[PDB]
Design a protein around this ligand. Structure first.
Ligand SMILES: [Cl-]
Length: 130
């Protein structure tokens, strides 16, 4: 698991936060993840140790990689131009898992980022610090 939300996980990429969890997506619909701007090709880091469980297109989120951390915690990384890991692999905190792209069809390169606890996307920011 990711443990208490204490700023101990790695930021997946560093850049300006373009959209925050819960912010307006379209009308009164809300984002259920963050969007962090970064140059095309920047490495995306696994935030914590885990198992890669998905590495495929998911409509609305371009190419997504999903890492399970155990005990009901997961992290999701979308809009990537490519994945650097395959489903089934174990990854380490900080390890490169994808490269930033525009596969979500966005206006500029950026990472789509979710943390799901007990199967539900929640604000990821409080875990991020390293
Ligand atoms: Cl898409």
């Amino acid at each position: 698991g990711l443990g208490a939300p204490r700023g101990q996980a790695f930021w997946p990429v560093r850049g300006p936060t373009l959209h925050r969890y819960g912010e307006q997506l379209q009308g009164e619909l809300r984002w259920k993840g963050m969007v962090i701007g970064a140059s095309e090709g920047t490495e995306v880091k696994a935030i914590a140790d885990g198992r890669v469980i998905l590495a495929d297109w998911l409509q609305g989120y371009g190419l997504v990689v999903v890492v399970e951390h155990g005990k009901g915690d997961m992290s999701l990384y979308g809009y990537n131009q490519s994945a650097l890991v395959s489903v089934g692999s174990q990854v380490r905190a900080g390890q490169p898992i994808a490269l930033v792209g525009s596969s979500g069809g966005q206006g500029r390169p950026s990472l789509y980022f979710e943390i799901r606890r007990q199967g539900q996307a929640v604000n990821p920011q409080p875990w991020l610090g390293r």
